[PDB]
């Protein structure tokens, strides 16, 4: 105990420090009874107890969704605390009414983010962090039995270092941004803790984006929320001290991002197919945001969007593989619709290869396009050849997955005559014409069905 005196000197200073909220005379407010609900994130269990509170009638601060009230509360850890010594607390409530469960899920959010702060601290960072415990008080005597969040008051300059929508703070501090990036890496890209705000490195009201995007309330923007973070994230020495992999940004994006007191200590420690798959979805989310104007600065950056569409396709995102296959094939496309790529023989090989990959991954649209390429040569790469057996393999795969009777009748046509490596099979041609006739009846194309039945008899008459 070479610091026991340092503890005492601080304890004595505190006994002589004045209450920063003395001027507000919260002790004069009529006392109110409340049930407090405190959460344990490791066990998932709740502990309830009865408390006495004195809450100001008017909020001293607010945001877009929540307002804060100055509050005093007696401790149930102390045995005989008088109101003259009550600690200072901040009570928070949603400005517009929300469902009661929101208050409980917000506590789960904050306490889960508190666990991630403890994980970050276990990697020996230059500056440690802590997320303030938040609980729920229930004012059962008030009209409607309203719920409030409650936490201890942290005196000092309240600063929002980042948001849940891409904002970054201008005397830039390294620790808040490194913590957020750490949670992305350490969780295997399954979550990120953002909206880092508070006093110093004591944080409150954080937000978690998850891969599913189903928990932690409406602030969970999913992989879109991770994209907003990494669009403006400049990795710092803490990010690299812990071996956090940088996000692959475009040349224009990296320069705009590249367009500090916290120093390393040499003790920082270092922090899967699922993550690379989530990483692909984060890249695809950047594409949609570029197209949607979220990254406005001139005109929407088409080159950076394509940069992220290729990274998404290379990471396995089927929507990106289909999109690039159509774009390199000079075909209409949904993603980056107004963007066109230069027609070149190299790209026409890439276009078909992407469409073939997408076909082999289950995309019905690519399977019909690949079938037609092997059938008629349309959109077929010049490295390949018309192959009617291969075309059969992709028509029927689409049928077993536009009109089905059209593809069934086409298969029968090819088998009635043969060609391009496919040997004729009249019996199968009549069978497929029969399936097409039945498919035409289910589509109310009765006259077309009679034609298919007649073509079936002719194929069998051979």
């Amino acid at each position: 105990f070479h610091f026991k005196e340092a503890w005492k000197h601080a304890i004595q200073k505190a006994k002589h420090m004045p209450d920063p909220w003395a001027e507000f005379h919260l002790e004069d407010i009529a006392t109110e009874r409340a049930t407090r609900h405190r959460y344990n994130a490791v066990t998932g269990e709740w502990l309830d107890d009865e408390v006495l509170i004195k809450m100001a009638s008017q909020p001293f601060g607010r945001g877009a969704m929540r307002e804060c009230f100055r509050t005093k509360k007696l401790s149930n850890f102390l045995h005989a605390q008088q109101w003259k010594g009550a600690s200072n607390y901040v009570a928070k409530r949603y400005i517009e009414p929300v469902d009661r469960d929101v208050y409980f899920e917000d506590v789960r959010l904050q306490m889960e983010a508190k666990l991630w702060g403890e994980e970050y601290n276990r990697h020996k960072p230059p500056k440690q962090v802590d997320i303030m415990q938040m609980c729920i008080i229930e004012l059962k005597d008030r009209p409607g039995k309203p719920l409030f969040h409650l936490e201890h008051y942290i005196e000092g300059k309240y600063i929002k270092y980042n948001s849940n929508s891409g904002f970054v703070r201008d005397n830039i501090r390294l620790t808040p941004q490194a913590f957020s990036h750490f949670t992305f890496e350490r969780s295997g890209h399954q979550l990120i803790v953002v909206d880092i705000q508070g006093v110093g490195d004591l944080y409150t009201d954080p937000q978690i984006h998850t891969e599913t995007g189903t928990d932690f309330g409406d602030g969970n923007l999913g992989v879109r929320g991770m994209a907003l973070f990494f669009y403006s994230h400049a990795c710092n020495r803490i990010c690299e001290s812990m071996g956090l992999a940088p996000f692959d940004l475009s040349p224009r994006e990296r320069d705009a991002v590249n367009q500090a007191k916290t120093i390393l200590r040499g003790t920082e420690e270092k922090c899967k197919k699922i993550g690379k798959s989530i990483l692909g979805k984060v890249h695809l989310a950047m594409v949609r945001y570029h197209e949607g104007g979220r990254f406005c600065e001139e005109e929407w950056d088409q080159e950076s969007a394509v940069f992220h569409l290729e990274h998404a396709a290379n990471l396995g995102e089927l929507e990106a593989i289909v999109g690039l296959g159509l774009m390199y094939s000079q075909l209409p496309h949904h993603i980056l619709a107004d963007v066109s790529l230069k027609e070149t023989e190299e790209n026409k090989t890439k276009g078909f290869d992407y469409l073939l990959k997408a076909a082999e991954a289950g995309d019905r649209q690519s399977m019909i396009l690949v079938a037609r390429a092997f059938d008629s040569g349309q959109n077929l790469s010049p490295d390949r050849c018309q192959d009617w057996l291969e075309a059969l393999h992709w028509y029927n795969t689409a049928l077993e997955m536009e009109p089905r009777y059209m593809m069934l009748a086409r298969e029968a046509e090819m088998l009635f005559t043969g060609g391009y490596g496919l040997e004729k099979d009249p019996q199968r041609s009549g069978d497929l014409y029969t399936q097409a006739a039945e498919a035409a009846m289910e589509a109310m194309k009765g006259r077309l069905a009679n034609q298919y039945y007649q073509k079936a008899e002719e194929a069998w008459a051979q």
Binding site: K4, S75, N121, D130, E155, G200
Partner: protein
């Protein structure tokens, strides 16, 4: 009286009231209290009392630090 006194002392440093004094909380309290200590002395104050090695100081570890003649 000294028991409550120690309990009140623990609440001075357990800034969020979760039962554990963290290094970040101790840094905030020492800075707010005007006490002049480097960011390393704060981490050492935690490590000296951290018997279970979880990086934080619970009440019992705090008691053992204060009631250790």
């Amino acid at each position: 009286d000294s028991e409550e006194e120690i309990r009140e002392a623990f609440r001075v440093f357990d800034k969020d009231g979760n039962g554990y004094i963290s290094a970040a909380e101790l840094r905030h309290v020492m800075t707010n209290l005007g006490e002049k200590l480097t960011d390393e002395e704060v981490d050492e104050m935690i490590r000296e009392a951290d018997i279970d090695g979880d990086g934080q100081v619970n009440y019992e570890e705090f008691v053992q630090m204060m009631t250790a003649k």
